[PDB]
Amino acid sequence: EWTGDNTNAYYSDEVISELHVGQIDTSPYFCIKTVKANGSGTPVVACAVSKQSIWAPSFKELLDQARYFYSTGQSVRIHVQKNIWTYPLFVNTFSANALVGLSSCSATQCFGPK
Amino acid sequence: EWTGDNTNAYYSDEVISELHVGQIDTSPYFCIKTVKANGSGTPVVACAVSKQSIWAPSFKELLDQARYFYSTGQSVRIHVQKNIWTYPLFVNTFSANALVGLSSCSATQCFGPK
Amino acid sequence: EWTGDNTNAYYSDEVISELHVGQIDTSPYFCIKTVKANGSGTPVVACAVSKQSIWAPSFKELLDQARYFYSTGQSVRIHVQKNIWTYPLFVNTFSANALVGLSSCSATQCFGPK
Amino acid sequence: EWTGDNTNAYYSDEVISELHVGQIDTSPYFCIKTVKANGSGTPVVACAVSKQSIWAPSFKELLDQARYFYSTGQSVRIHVQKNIWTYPLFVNTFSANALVGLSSCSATQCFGPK
Amino acid sequence: EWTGDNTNAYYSDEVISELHVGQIDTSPYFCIKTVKANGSGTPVVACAVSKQSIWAPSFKELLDQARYFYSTGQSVRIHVQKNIWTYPLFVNTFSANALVGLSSCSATQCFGPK
Numbered sequence: 116e117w118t119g120d121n122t123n124a125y126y127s128d129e130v131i132s133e134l135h136v137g138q139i140d141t142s143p144y145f146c147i148k149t150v151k152a153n154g155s156g157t158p159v160v161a162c163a164v165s166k167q168s169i170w171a172p173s174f175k176e177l178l179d180q181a182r183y184f185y186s187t188g189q190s191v192r193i194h195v196q197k198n199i200w201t202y203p204l205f206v207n208t209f210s211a212n213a214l215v216g217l218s219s220c221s222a223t224q225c226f227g228p229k
Numbered sequence: 230e231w232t233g234d235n236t237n238a239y240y241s242d243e244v245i246s247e248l249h250v251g252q253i254d255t256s257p258y259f260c261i262k263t264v265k266a267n268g269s270g271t272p273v274v275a276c277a278v279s280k281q282s283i284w285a286p287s288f289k290e291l292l293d294q295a296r297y298f299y300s301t302g303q304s305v306r307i308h309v310q311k312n313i314w315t316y317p318l319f320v321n322t323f324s325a326n327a328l329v330g331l332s333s334c335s336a337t338q339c340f341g342p343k
Numbered sequence: 344e345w346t347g348d349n350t351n352a353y354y355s356d357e358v359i360s361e362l363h364v365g366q367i368d369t370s371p372y373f374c375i376k377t378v379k380a381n382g383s384g385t386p387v388v389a390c391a392v393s394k395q396s397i398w399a400p401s402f403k404e405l406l407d408q409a410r411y412f413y414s415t416g417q418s419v420r421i422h423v424q425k426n427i428w429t430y431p432l433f434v435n436t437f438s439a440n441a442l443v444g445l446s447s448c449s450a451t452q453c454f455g456p457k
Numbered sequence: 458e459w460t461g462d463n464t465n466a467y468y469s470d471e472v473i474s475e476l477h478v479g480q481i482d483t484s485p486y487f488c489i490k491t492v493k494a495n496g497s498g499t500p501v502v503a504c505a506v507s508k509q510s511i512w513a514p515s516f517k518e519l520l521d522q523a524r525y526f527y528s529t530g531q532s533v534r535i536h537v538q539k540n541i542w543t544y545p546l547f548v549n550t551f552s553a554n555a556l557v558g559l560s561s562c563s564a565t566q567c568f569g570p571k
Numbered sequence: 572e573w574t575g576d577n578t579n580a581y582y583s584d585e586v587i588s589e590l591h592v593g594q595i596d597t598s599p600y601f602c603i604k605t606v607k608a609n610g611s612g613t614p615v616v617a618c619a620v621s622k623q624s625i626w627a628p629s630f631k632e633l634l635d636q637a638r639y640f641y642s643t644g645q646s647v648r649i650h651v652q653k654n655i656w657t658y659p660l661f662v663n664t665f666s667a668n669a670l671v672g673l674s675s676c677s678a679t680q681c682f683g684p685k
């Protein structure tokens with residue numbers, strides 16, 4: 116598996132606008148909401164769960180990087196894998212998207228896969 | 230279990246106004262006091278205790294997040310489970326609430342379960 | 344044991360003014376000095392040693408919180424247990440106080456046991 | 458092995474201009490892009506991958522240091538070992554360079570193996 | 572062993588002016604360069620290696636404290652043990668000094684052993 120697999124999805128020129136931390140099934144988790152830097156479009160919601168999914172190994176690195184980009188407000192590309200989380204009330208509150216990567220973006224491109 | 234279980238309680242549009250770190254019965258712990266951003270209501274107190282209660286796995290994540298939201302003064306939703314801590318002097322100083330989640334808030338919503 | 348045990352000692356309305364990190368007996372340790380926010384009184388010195396005393400489990404949380412309050416310069420209540428450290432040159436440089444808690448203070452009260 | 462081995466390569470007077478975090482083949486990784494502080498030259502890209510390559514033990518220290526130098530934007534010397542990553546889509550997006558060291562370039566010259 | 576052993580050396584009122592992170596013999600390490608706050612004298616260089624020397628246990632605490640003092644620019648007392656590192660190209664680049672402690676300094680005296 117790789118963040119950049121074309122079976123994942125990504126959204127460019129976004130800003131992390133909200134942050135949530137909690138616990139589910141004895142696992143810490145966090146979620147972020149991102150919006151376009153220009154405010155257009157629909158928010159992207161993605162979560163990472165410390166003990167669950169093939170992306171569990173990257174939990175701490177992604178939590179620290181989400182916190183960093185949240186604090187700076189800078190433009191990023193957010194990479195997700197769709198249809199991962201399945202607890203129905205959790206998906207209703209957040210989404211089924213697993214967070215799988217974060218890339219900084221300049222005005223002309225983003226530093227990350229496609 | 231989940232932060233968003235309907236048997237937990239939550240308080241929206243709160244500001245983390247105080248922070249305390251200590252040790253009890255071999256466990257580092259922290260407590261926070263939150264107050265409504267608009268001055269309404271009565272303060273909420275919640276604590277997380279390392280290696281104690283079902284919420285133990287998220288101790289470090291919640292401590293780091295509470296420190297961040299405390300440092301910014303931003304409005305948050307605080308999620309608790311009531312009647313968890315039983316040590317009587319501790320409860321009298323702080324409360325029996327276990328901290329189980331923290332959510333950022335916007336002008337119209339908070340980014341977490343309700 | 345608890346930070347708030349009345350056999351411990353505390354000092355309100357203090358500012359963390361100095362910070363030292365070192366090693367002793369293969370254990371990382373740190374010490375702080377605090378002074379009254381209003382400039383009066385006698386400084387308080389307290390140390391924490393990663394592998395020593397009943398307070399060892401809280402070493403990392405107290406170090407992070409000491410660094411936080413040191414960086415903000417805000418007024419705090421410092422909680423200690425007297426007569427813990429015993430190596431004479433160490434006590435002469437610093438003190439025998441073990442650090443056991445740190446509480447934020449407002450103008451009127453401190454958020455911690457009293 | 459050593460960061461300063463002559464078989465490694467380095468680039469002075471660079472600024473960390475982009476940062477990416479993801480996961481590949483069970484491993485969290487990060488990549489950085491650096492450009493000459495004075496605007497000349499060609500960017501350098503380097504990556505560190507947890508639990509992969511001989512440089513695995515320093516993954517967390519290099520991630521933390523890359524973040525710090527990225528946040529200040531100060532001039533640095535980046536140390537790499539060429540031709541380490543072989544995953545072809547990854548190399549095309551980023552590079553085959555393993556990040557093996559970071560040195561400040563305050564004042565006089567770069568504070569690292571030369 | 573202790574940071575304050577009289578067989579160690581220390582240098583007061585120093586400013587951390589450079590920082591380097593790398594790897595050697597499968598161990599992360601860092602080095603700092605310090606200079607007197609008034610610019611007199613000659614620089615002090617010291618390094619910490621995570622898996623080597625009796626000071627290995629305090630590697631992370633020292634790296635975190637070095638980063639903090641490097642970012643503030645405040646005057647510190649640096650404590651070292653001489654003639655510890657032995658790889659010749661490493662010693663010639665940096666020094667043989669092991670970093671063994673870091674103390675903040677008031678306007679009149681440093682907060683650590685002397």
Ligand SMILES: CC(=O)N[C@@H]1[C@@H](O)[C@H](O[C@@H]2O[C@H](CO)[C@H](O)[C@H](O[C@]3(C(=O)O)C[C@H](O)[C@@H](NC(C)=O)[C@H]([C@H](O)[C@H](O)CO)O3)[C@H]2O)[C@@H](CO)O[C@H]1O
Nearest residue numbers: 123124125126127128151155156157220223224225228229
């Ligand atoms: C490397 C390469 O060949 N092309 C990339 C390319 O991805 C991208 O070009 C377009 O740039 C605009 C704004 O910069 C958008 O980025 C475009 O749409 C994308 C995006 O956000 O990147 C593409 C993405 O695949 C889409 N994801 C899904 C699930 O559909 C999203 C999504 O539709 C929207 O984001 C929702 O609002 O849109 C993109 O085509 C740029 C980006 O920097 O860089 C090129 O090099």
Ligand SMILES: CC(=O)N[C@@H]1[C@@H](O)[C@H](O[C@@H]2O[C@H](CO)[C@H](O)[C@H](O[C@]3(C(=O)O)C[C@H](O)[C@@H](NC(C)=O)[C@H]([C@H](O)[C@H](O)CO)O3)[C@H]2O)[C@@H](CO)O[C@H]1O
Nearest residue numbers: 139140144164166167168169198199200201202203205206
């Ligand atoms: C390929 C695909 O999309 N899904 C398959 C699916 O056939 C199946 O799903 C998993 O199987 C059982 C229940 O049938 C597990 O209980 C998983 O449920 C949980 C889990 O405990 O792991 C419940 C948990 O609440 C979920 N966490 C959240 C935040 O929602 C997790 C989580 O979605 C997964 O762990 C993510 O990978 O799932 C259930 O998903 C199994 C059977 O082979 O395989 C899937 O791939």
Ligand SMILES: CC(=O)N[C@@H]1[C@@H](O)[C@H](O[C@@H]2O[C@H](CO)[C@H](O)[C@H](O[C@]3(C(=O)O)C[C@H](O)[C@@H](NC(C)=O)[C@H]([C@H](O)[C@H](O)CO)O3)[C@H]2O)[C@@H](CO)O[C@H]1O
Nearest residue numbers: 138139140141142202203204205230231232233234235236
């Ligand atoms: C994987 C592991 O280590 N432990 C899981 C364990 O988490 C799981 O417990 C369930 O976890 C879910 C979240 O994933 C909920 O927190 C459940 O709370 C319940 C409850 O226990 O009463 C269940 C569910 O949320 C609801 N009722 C159901 C499914 O019947 C109610 C809730 O009030 C709703 O509002 C009504 O829909 O709360 C909790 O049971 C257990 C059981 O799946 O499995 C372990 O593997």
Ligand SMILES: CC(=O)N[C@@H]1[C@@H](O)[C@H](O[C@@H]2O[C@H](CO)[C@H](O)[C@H](O[C@]3(C(=O)O)C[C@H](O)[C@@H](NC(C)=O)[C@H]([C@H](O)[C@H](O)CO)O3)[C@H]2O)[C@@H](CO)O[C@H]1O
Nearest residue numbers: 351352353354355356379381383384385420451452453457
């Ligand atoms: C009438 C009047 O106003 N007298 C003032 C008085 O307000 C004040 O006394 C101190 O006030 C602070 C208020 O935060 C504390 O209540 C001090 O009590 C404590 C403390 O919390 O710091 C109690 C504690 O048990 C004591 N610790 C030990 C080991 O004995 C400490 C300690 O004695 C002092 O902190 C050391 O300086 O005191 C209370 O003493 C002061 C000035 O504000 O003195 C009068 O002017």
Ligand SMILES: CC(=O)N[C@@H]1[C@@H](O)[C@H](O[C@@H]2O[C@H](CO)[C@H](O)[C@H](O[C@]3(C(=O)O)C[C@H](O)[C@@H](NC(C)=O)[C@H]([C@H](O)[C@H](O)CO)O3)[C@H]2O)[C@@H](CO)O[C@H]1O
Nearest residue numbers: 367368372390392394395396397427428429430431433434
């Ligand atoms: C030989 C000499 O000159 N002095 C030693 C003295 O160092 C030491 O004192 C006592 O030893 C018993 C156990 O033998 C206690 O454990 C205490 O020792 C130590 C310890 O646990 O290592 C010594 C250590 O230096 C102390 N650490 C600091 C920072 O001061 C700790 C510490 O106070 C406690 O751990 C706190 O709970 O205590 C001490 O009572 C012994 C060495 O055999 O004998 C003297 O002669």
Ligand SMILES: CC(=O)N[C@@H]1[C@@H](O)[C@H](O[C@@H]2O[C@H](CO)[C@H](O)[C@H](O[C@]3(C(=O)O)C[C@H](O)[C@@H](NC(C)=O)[C@H]([C@H](O)[C@H](O)CO)O3)[C@H]2O)[C@@H](CO)O[C@H]1O
Nearest residue numbers: 458459460461462463464465595596597598658659660661
């Ligand atoms: C203790 C442990 O876990 N592993 C060591 C292992 O690190 C050590 O390897 C030597 O490490 C030193 C630094 O301490 C040098 O990096 C040596 O590097 C070499 C190199 O990597 O190529 C070896 C030799 O000196 C030269 N190259 C060879 C023989 O291929 C070059 C040359 O000096 C540089 O180019 C200088 O610019 O450096 C490395 O062998 C081994 C052997 O000491 O012992 C393990 O236990």
Ligand SMILES: CC(=O)N[C@@H]1[C@@H](O)[C@H](O[C@@H]2O[C@H](CO)[C@H](O)[C@H](O[C@]3(C(=O)O)C[C@H](O)[C@@H](NC(C)=O)[C@H]([C@H](O)[C@H](O)CO)O3)[C@H]2O)[C@@H](CO)O[C@H]1O
Nearest residue numbers: 465466467468469470471493495497498499534566567571
């Ligand atoms: C003034 C003139 O005529 N030409 C200058 C030229 O002298 C100068 O070259 C660079 O100067 C800097 C000074 O810090 C470095 O010394 C560069 O050396 C190194 C470097 O450390 O960056 C050495 C290193 O071994 C080289 N790495 C590799 C893989 O070969 C790098 C690398 O070639 C360059 O960094 C790539 O751009 O160079 C030295 O080259 C500069 C002015 O600063 O450019 C001309 O104007």
Ligand SMILES: CC(=O)N[C@@H]1[C@@H](O)[C@H](O[C@@H]2O[C@H](CO)[C@H](O)[C@H](O[C@]3(C(=O)O)C[C@H](O)[C@@H](NC(C)=O)[C@H]([C@H](O)[C@H](O)CO)O3)[C@H]2O)[C@@H](CO)O[C@H]1O
Nearest residue numbers: 366367368369370430431432433572573574575576577578
């Ligand atoms: C508990 C563990 O894991 N290891 C300890 C080990 O740390 C300890 O070594 C002693 O540690 C103390 C600090 O706790 C000092 O660093 C000691 O240095 C001394 C020394 O050289 O012996 C100790 C003492 O203060 C003095 N020695 C005397 C009076 O004989 C000298 C002093 O500075 C003068 O220079 C002497 O003329 O410093 C160090 O030995 C050992 C022994 O306690 O126990 C292990 O278990």
Ligand SMILES: CC(=O)N[C@@H]1[C@@H](O)[C@H](O[C@@H]2O[C@H](CO)[C@H](O)[C@H](O[C@]3(C(=O)O)C[C@H](O)[C@@H](NC(C)=O)[C@H]([C@H](O)[C@H](O)CO)O3)[C@H]2O)[C@@H](CO)O[C@H]1O
Nearest residue numbers: 595596600620622623624625654655656657658659661662
């Ligand atoms: C004779 C003199 O002038 N000084 C000596 C010194 O040369 C000598 O070297 C030590 O001897 C041991 C014996 O096994 C090893 O050779 C040590 O090797 C290494 C190691 O641990 O791998 C090599 C390594 O590269 C070194 N790391 C760095 C950053 O340089 C480490 C490190 O220095 C030690 O671990 C420090 O504790 O050492 C080598 O140090 C011995 C002779 O006993 O000490 C002086 O007297």
